[PDB]
Amino acid sequence: PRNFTLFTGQWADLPLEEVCRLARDFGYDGLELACWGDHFEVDKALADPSYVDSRHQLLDKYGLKCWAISNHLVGQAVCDAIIDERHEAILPARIWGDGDAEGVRQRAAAEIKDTARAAARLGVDTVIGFTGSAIWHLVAMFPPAPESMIERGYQDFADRWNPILDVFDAEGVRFAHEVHPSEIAYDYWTTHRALEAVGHRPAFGLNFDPSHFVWQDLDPVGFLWDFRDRIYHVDCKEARKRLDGRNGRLGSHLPWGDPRRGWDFVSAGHGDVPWEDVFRMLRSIDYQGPVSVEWEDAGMDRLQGAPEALTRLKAFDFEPPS
Amino acid sequence: PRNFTLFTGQWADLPLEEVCRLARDFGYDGLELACWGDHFEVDKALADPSYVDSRHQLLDKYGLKCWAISNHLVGQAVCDAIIDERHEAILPARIWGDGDAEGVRQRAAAEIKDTARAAARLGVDTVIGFTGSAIWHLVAMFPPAPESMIERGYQDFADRWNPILDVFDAEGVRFAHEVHPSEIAYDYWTTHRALEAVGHRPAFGLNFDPSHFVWQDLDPVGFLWDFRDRIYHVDCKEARKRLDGRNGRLGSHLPWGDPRRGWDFVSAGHGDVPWEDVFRMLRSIDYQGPVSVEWEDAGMDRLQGAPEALTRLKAFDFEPPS
Amino acid sequence: PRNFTLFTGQWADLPLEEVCRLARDFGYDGLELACWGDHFEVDKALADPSYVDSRHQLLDKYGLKCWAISNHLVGQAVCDAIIDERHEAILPARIWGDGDAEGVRQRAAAEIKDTARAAARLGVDTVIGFTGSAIWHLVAMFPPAPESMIERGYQDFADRWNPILDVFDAEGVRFAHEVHPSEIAYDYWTTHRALEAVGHRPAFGLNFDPSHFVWQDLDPVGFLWDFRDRIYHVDCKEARKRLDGRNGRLGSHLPWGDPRRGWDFVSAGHGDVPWEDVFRMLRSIDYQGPVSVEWEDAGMDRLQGAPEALTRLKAFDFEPP
Amino acid sequence: PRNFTLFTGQWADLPLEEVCRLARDFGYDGLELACWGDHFEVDKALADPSYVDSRHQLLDKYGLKCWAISNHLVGQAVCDAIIDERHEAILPARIWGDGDAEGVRQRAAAEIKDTARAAARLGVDTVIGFTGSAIWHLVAMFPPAPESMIERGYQDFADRWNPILDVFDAEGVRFAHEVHPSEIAYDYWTTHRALEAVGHRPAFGLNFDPSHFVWQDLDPVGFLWDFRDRIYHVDCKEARKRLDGRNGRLGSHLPWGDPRRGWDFVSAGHGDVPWEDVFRMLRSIDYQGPVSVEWEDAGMDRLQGAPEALTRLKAFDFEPPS
Amino acid sequence: PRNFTLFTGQWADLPLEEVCRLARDFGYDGLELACWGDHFEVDKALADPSYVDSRHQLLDKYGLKCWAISNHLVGQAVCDAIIDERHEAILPARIWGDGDAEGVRQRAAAEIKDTARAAARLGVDTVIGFTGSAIWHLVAMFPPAPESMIERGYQDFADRWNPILDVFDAEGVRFAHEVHPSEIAYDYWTTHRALEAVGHRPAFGLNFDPSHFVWQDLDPVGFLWDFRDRIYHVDCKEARKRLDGRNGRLGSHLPWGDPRRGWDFVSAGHGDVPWEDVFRMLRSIDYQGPVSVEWEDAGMDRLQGAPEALTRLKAFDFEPP
Amino acid sequence: PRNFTLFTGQWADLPLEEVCRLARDFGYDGLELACWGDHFEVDKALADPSYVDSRHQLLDKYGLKCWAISNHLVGQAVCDAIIDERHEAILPARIWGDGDAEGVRQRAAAEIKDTARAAARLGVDTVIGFTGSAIWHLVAMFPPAPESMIERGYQDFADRWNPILDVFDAEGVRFAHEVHPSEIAYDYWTTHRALEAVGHRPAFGLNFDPSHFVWQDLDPVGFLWDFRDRIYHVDCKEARKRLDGRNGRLGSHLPWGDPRRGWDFVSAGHGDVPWEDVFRMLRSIDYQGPVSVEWEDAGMDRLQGAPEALTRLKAFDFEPPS
């Protein structure tokens, strides 16, 4: 009886129609559409008056709903200080353009304004994404950066995103920033500071994803409570620690699935997230949106895990007392 | 009856002579000389054939020995991919030069070479320092970097450091890299990979500092065991966690002393480092160098903390059995 | 398998026939009959010669048995020092009477005596209940109470219960006291002390419910072992802690289901009770009674939770070798 | 260093002068005066114009200061719903009167107003105390009380204490409620609710005593941060858990020092209170008052424990830095 | 999926045909055959040229395969310093003989050489077993044993086993020693020392059973990584601690199922083995053998537990990406 | 609880007089005399009527007392089923005889009887010892041993020790069996069972030593409580765990001091024994005997560790309340 959604980003190698068939076979109520692959093309949603109708027709055909779209990939390029080949690999060529860092940040900003406009054409009220950060690479604090440098990072985020959020407001759409490493908000305390930076304006809320709370030792339940009025979307993504004295909290620059990582992504129920408290708290905060599933586990096949993760997560979804 | 030594880096605002006076009053047996302030000037050591004697005479005046010198500040600039104002603030103007990233890296490598030469002049066999890292900023792994980018980070370390280490070998001096965040080896597993990158050559060993093993959940005692042949120096630096669910393992880009940080440096005995096991393991490993103390605690005055830390650490220094 | 029963107290808003019908559909083998609502009326059981048979006939129609009845509500008012509107709300008007504290305590005692009589008529050998406590409200120990005041509390328990227990003995019925906050025995050590107050007499045994062991940090398995000869009934009631630094062990006088509580009642399998060890220990102590379920979870619907709790609990119920 | 005072409550069997001799011997800087024994007699303070200077003269003689007086015993009787022999034993006979509950509560309120007036005469700006509670005995919630009964106990607190606190305001004194079992505020959440019942008026603040935080599992550091603006006084009282599966968190109505209790009061440093974190946070919040020591340990002699407790507590009292 | 196998040892009171029927009903893919009961008789396998084919026919009849046989009972007698009625109870009379310690030890060695030969005839590449130990009884270290006495025990292992393992090499069969108490290798460190004793020769590998890693506080996952090139077989046996301050890690010489043991054997999923990490690690080390189940739980019936244990374990068996 | 003694067993390489001088310089009040070395010779104490006065004179000379003598080495050979080179190393040649197992057991019994007689001559009322065990070697339970074999081991203990204990009773002396691996009572539950075996007769009590409780995860405090009527003596010996996933609870047959052991003996205050609770409980159960120190730490020199261990342990010795 909550609505459950599959995040489409891990499936962007597949045509949308195949993802629709799969998600239906898996039992999902809907899709959280990634703004990449052929899933939701923001440029086409704006150029072609038919395009948004093709999206509904396709989803409707499989009995699927959509309450949100996601543009992590472009949002990352808005504030990142170091714009390089990793960005080139995740951006459309039209956003990359000549590869000039400031050029890319401006083009990414323009594209996020277009994402809100496309969301509203689609008729959804929430865009999930990332912001990037001018300051993330300073996280270790050696060599020391002055406080004015850290503050300028938050001011930079405000200066680039305030104009983006103006368009969000004009379109009647919300941004759900996913608190996550690499971002201006990645912590409980950085989320405070990032919210302060944009005057707590209602356009800028949060995509809650509990996975990165695990290795940082953040209480996801207390985060849900303290930021209750800014919980705009939920993605269930599971993480498992294996800290044996050798493996470390940072993962050692090692690929997903390498067992020498102190932590890794695993299918729901196979990890450490306290789903019991998380679900009870979404009710306590009267979170009314979809519950999305971002499926990732390097030791599993997605065809087996994605439906199993839905089953495991639903054991925590209860009818309220009547 | 192990020799205890005070690391001079947190004291570089002071003339060496004043540091010698305090270290003597505090009970230390010697100084670990920072290659900054007026403590150990690597250029003067090489240009002025009288300079090395001035160091011995000053040290001897206060009953102090020296078995090691340290150049974390220049070492950092050898491999760092992002060279900026933070490096400008820690470098002599003659190393910074024009500020060009690669130029600074080249001048920094040259200076570390001169550091080995200066060490040989002083008669000490170990240089403590940092390496920097071309890939540290990629730690979070979003946006993704291909495995090849990571591999080139370790190869970059090898290509910059092999020639510096060749000079160490020629001078009869060892490098003690301090495993620490923002370095090519910051971890148990990245230590293994960095040693491999230089073929386990004996010139490249390790400065053991347990402070950053705390937030990363690394066992300092197993590290000591597995890398026992490359433990070239020891710096006792203490760290305390305070992980209440809001504070996080990353520290939130928050200044030392801020109580919202998930962990902080504190004076020895006031944190979480397992000194009992560490000291027992140094004996098991037959570590026969000095035990140095790097004093740091933003909640305390150094003039009170430095002598107390020495007393707290000596409670773990026991006579071996006959 | 073991026989599993549903406690009827949380369903006293419903006519017994609807509870029978639900318990059958949920897969329960029987009912633990609350002595309130229309479930089990002690006075009718003794006055109307046909009443007990009406209970049998209803339960039998639904494929259900009964091994135990419960009178927590009346038992509470036997020893409580502070008799007030809370007791009024849980008592029938005949027991409340004029509302005079001593008179209530005495009428409540008479009614527990009658509960044992009613149980014997029904053919069950256990009555679950509460005792109340003259000293519960002294639990915090500021302002200090002298030790003589504490001792008088246990002696008050013995003085009021010994005559009730004489009647249980006459009727050949056991009393299964629910070790629970607000009772003379709420703890491992207060259980020892209460048992001694009554000379370890076999009439006064224990209803084991692990839920309140959770927040008090009591080992339910050791309690099972050390009190093995006096474990007379079991109610599986689950509780979950959420102790985040702000939420506290006492629950801050907050209603059930408030997330600011340090612990709360949740449905079986969703909390902290060590069911694996509890169930293995029930076999080791040769507990041969029913396994009852008292269903509570302010975050859930009883229609969904009651049958799920049954299923979750049956995963810990093993065939003997 | 900070100033440390001895709380006089556990010494009220002794004449004040004797306590001054002992506190001076133990190394304390001052006394938190209990409003009982012959330590601080509130009625004499107001009746006898020379009484208050007799207090200063006596304290001055021993080089002791006073920053606070304490009336736990009387304050308890203001809101308590059950008034009985426990109150008779802690109250002056002039307040107990005939022992009729409402008369006791009325008399106790009038005496707490007098305590504020006597504070102002003595020249101290803080009174520590208790409030008692109309609803504490409801803590277990069987047999159930309606939610309106709970709300009424908080309103009873406000109605009885608002007129007391008006006198505090008029006299220029503040009240430091000790969060503690048996009081309207005994928990983190009940403190919030109690502060809100009196509209967060600055007359009503808090005496911080970490000992009852231990068995309740309350984070005392987070408490200090969240109520930083209402920490009016600090009392260090230590507590040790021994929760072996048999002993329980409630203490089983067992006397202090009985080993079957799940927790007990012990001398500072023999228990579980995180003093390292507590003292650091006191600086972080800029608590500038005295650090008082309430000495209690049924397994020890006070003559030994009191000076030792001071010594262990001073180990956490750091000079700044400068 | 992986192939799952039932170890036949706890089932040796039953004829092999009954065991096959049950394992098929339970859902197993195969049998790990115990070299006792009528399950796999090494002497008959060798003397009777058609015995092996009766093993195959019987297994094929129930759709079962066999990748491994086990001879823990005879293996134990090879190195054991104290040979007594515990050994007489687990040996064929022909191996026990006169009961002279050295006599049994030599006869046991000869019989393990024959087990390797019987395995080769059957067509399996792995024998699971035990070694015994000349120094096990010295584990507590009071009264003190000289370090030379301890080296001698490992040398005794190498001297008795090297010749056995030459037969394994001749026959194209591996020995999977089960790291387990009372064995020369029972720990992480003792395994290192025993592999060194035989110069890490590839004939001597390991049977991985995580059960005894639990009470000894050994990381089964790190053991798998560090000994990855020598994990020759896997037996899923589950273990549960209950260390309440009275119960101790040694089990107090108390029988299986006694609630006063610090740890006990329990059915898969009921105890403490980190199956999630174990299974992921089996894939990371490219373990390609069967996953066997040794079923043991004194609190439970095997007819209920063996199929359930299979179901619980398979929830950790996931397809590769 | 406050006379402290030094156990002399680890000092038996030295003349008694030299142990006395050291124990006195260390600050010990007395000695727990081992029945080996030249410290206390059981046969001479019975044969020579001046021998016992020589002991008193030597201890008086150094201001030392004695309340107890120990014969671990001989006691272990009464019940041990496997009598070999290990017993030969710890036994006097007159007890070892020809080494035939049953004769050794029989002679060790006769010698323990004489140890009671000699305790009485010295004027002490307690002998500390071991019993050995016919069943210790069966602890791992593979190959299986029938339950009747286990029962026989406890009957064997009763059969051999009952007659020993009758001699203790005749002399007015008690036996304090040290619960310890390799004994018939090594556990909480095997202690119950051994006590039952001898009908809870008062001659057979217990020497409490917490060190072996650590690795077995036994609560030393609950033990003291449940066996309170049989705590005849206390030896404070400390132990420390290091269980990193590779080291095991059993210690891998590795010598003391090897870092690959899962636990080891360390000097008091350097391990895991809960001294705070241990000392409080000795006082709760009214233990009035001495507190002996058995000093052992392969990582330390006994000349520094023995006085230090006493200083640490004394920090838990509190004056009772007045």
How close, in Å, is residue D244 to chain E by CA atoms? 7
Question: In angstroms, rounded to a whole number, what is the distance separating the alpha carbons of residues C255 and E2?
Answer: 50
Instruction: Check: CB of residue C114 under 8 Å from CB of residue C46.
Output: yes
Chains with 3 or more CB pairs under 8 A to chain A: B, C, E, F
Write down how long chain D is.
322
Distance between first and last Cα of chain E: 12
Chains F and C touch (3+ CB pairs under 8 A): no
Question: In angstroms, rounded to a whole number, what is the distance separating the alpha carbons of residues A223 and A213?
Answer: 10
Chain A residues with beta carbon closer than 8 angstroms to that of E221: 242, 244, 259
Question: In angstroms, rounded to a whole number, what is the distance separating the alpha carbons of residues A233 and A30?
Answer: 14
Which residue has tokens 């019989």? E111
What is the DSSP pairing of strand F238-241 with strand F263-266? antiparallel
Q: Which residues pair with C174 in a beta bridge?
A: C126
Beta carbons of C149 and D85 less than 8 Å apart:
yes
Q: Which of E145, E216, E254 comes nearest F86 by C-beta?
A: E145
Name the residue type at position E131. Answer: T
Beta carbons of C276 and E298 less than 8 Å apart:
no
Beta carbons of A252 and B215 less than 8 Å apart:
no
Beta carbons of E321 and A299 less than 8 Å apart:
yes
Q: Which residue of B has its CA nearest to A80?
A: B143
Residues in Cβ contact with E113 at an 8 Å cutoff, skipping those fewer than 6 apart: E163, E164, E167
Instruction: Check: CB of residue B248 under 8 Å from CB of residue B264.
Output: no
Could you tell me the two tokens for B224? Answer: 């000591």
Question: In angstroms, rounded to a whole number, what is the distance separating the alpha carbons of residues F116 and F66?
Answer: 15
Q: Cβ-count burial of F13 within 10 angstroms (0-12 exposed, 13-18 middle, 19+ buried)?
A: exposed
* Bond prior to A255 in cis (omega within 30° of 0): no
Query: Experimental method for this entry?
Result: X-ray
* Overall number of domains in chain E: 1
Q: Which of B219, B319, B321 comes nearest F298 by C-beta?
A: B321
Q: Which of A86, A217, A248 comes nearest B262 by C-beta?
A: A217
Write down how long chain F is.
322
Q: Which residue of B has its CA nearest to D277?
A: B242
Which residue has tokens 């014969």? F71
Question: In angstroms, rounded to a whole number, what is the distance separating the alpha carbons of residues F305 and F298?
Answer: 11
For chain B, what is the radius of gyration of the CA atoms? Answer: 19
Instruction: Check: CB of residue B301 under 8 Å from CB of residue D322.
Output: yes
Chains with 3 or more CB pairs under 8 A to chain C: A, B, D, E
* Bond prior to C143 in cis (omega within 30° of 0): yes
Q: Which of D242, D302, D303 comes nearest F277 by C-beta?
A: D242
Chain E residues with beta carbon closer than 8 angstroms to that of D244: 245
Name the residue type at position A66. Answer: C
Mutation target to probe the B interface, by most B beta carbons within 10 A, among D280, D312, D319 is D280
Instruction: Check: CB of residue C239 under 8 Å from CB of residue C209.
Output: no
Neighbours of E24 (CB within 10 A): 18
**SS3 of D94, please?**
helix
CB of C244 within 8 Å of any CB in chain A?
A: yes
- Closest of F207, F204, F265 to residue F234, by C-alpha: F207
- Closest of C141, E137, C269, C260 to residue F135, by C-alpha: E137
Which residue has tokens 């899923």? E236
Residue D236 belongs to a domain with what CATH number? 3.20.20.150
Q: Give the alpha-carbon dihedral of E47, E49, E51, E57, to 10 degrees.
A: 170
Instruction: Check: CB of residue C290 under 8 Å from CB of residue C5.
Output: yes
Which residue has tokens 């083998």? C29
Q: Please give the helix or strand (H or E) that residue A143 lies within, else none.
A: none
Any alpha helices (H) in chain E, and if so which ranges? 16-26, 42-47, 51-61, 72-79, 85-90, 93-96, 101-122, 147-171, 188-197, 211-215, 220-226, 275-284, 302-314
Cβ under 8 Å to F: B residues 169-228: 219, 221-222, 225
Neighbours of B6 (CB within 10 A): 29
- Closest of F236, A13, D284 to residue B247, by C-alpha: D284
Q: Please give the helix or strand (H or E) that residue A178 lies within, else none.
A: strand A174-178
Taken in order E77, E79, E85, E86, is the CA torsion positive or negative? negative
Residues in Cβ contact with C190 at an 8 Å cutoff, skipping those fewer than 6 apart: C179, C184, D252, D253
Residues in Cβ contact with D213 at an 8 Å cutoff, skipping those fewer than 6 apart: D219, D220, D223, D273
Beta carbons of D253 and C138 less than 8 Å apart:
yes
Could you tell me the two tokens for B16? Answer: 């060496």
Chain A residues with beta carbon closer than 8 angstroms to that of C14: none
Q: Which residue of C has its CA nearest to E304?
A: C319
DSSP secondary structure string for all residues of E1-31: ---EEEESGGGTTS-HHHHHHHHHHHT-SEE
Residues in Cβ contact with D120 at an 8 Å cutoff, skipping those fewer than 6 apart: D171, D172, D173
Instruction: Check: CB of residue C209 under 8 Å from CB of residue C271.
Output: no
Could you tell me the two tokens for F204? Answer: 């057979």
DSSP secondary structure string for all residues of C166-204: HHHHHHT-EEEEE--TTSS--SHHHHHHHHHHTTT-TTE
Q: Which residue of D has its CA nearest to E245?
A: D244
Any alpha helices (H) in chain D, and if so which ranges? 16-26, 42-47, 51-61, 72-79, 85-90, 93-96, 101-122, 147-171, 188-197, 211-216, 220-226, 275-284, 302-314
User: How many helices and strands (H and E) does chain F possess?
Assistant: 13, 10
Q: Cβ-count burial of E198 within 10 angstroms (0-12 exposed, 13-18 middle, 19+ buried)?
A: middle
Beta carbons of B240 and D318 less than 8 Å apart:
no
Chain F residues with beta carbon closer than 8 angstroms to that of E227: none
**SS3 of F266, please?**
strand
Question: In angstroms, rounded to a whole number, what is the distance separating the alpha carbons of residues E259 and E251?
Answer: 10
Q: Tell me which residue range forms the domain holding C34.
A: 1-321
Mutation target to probe the A interface, by most A beta carbons within 10 A, among C11, C301, C302 is C301
Which residue has tokens 């009995």? A63
Which residue has tokens 């105390």? D129
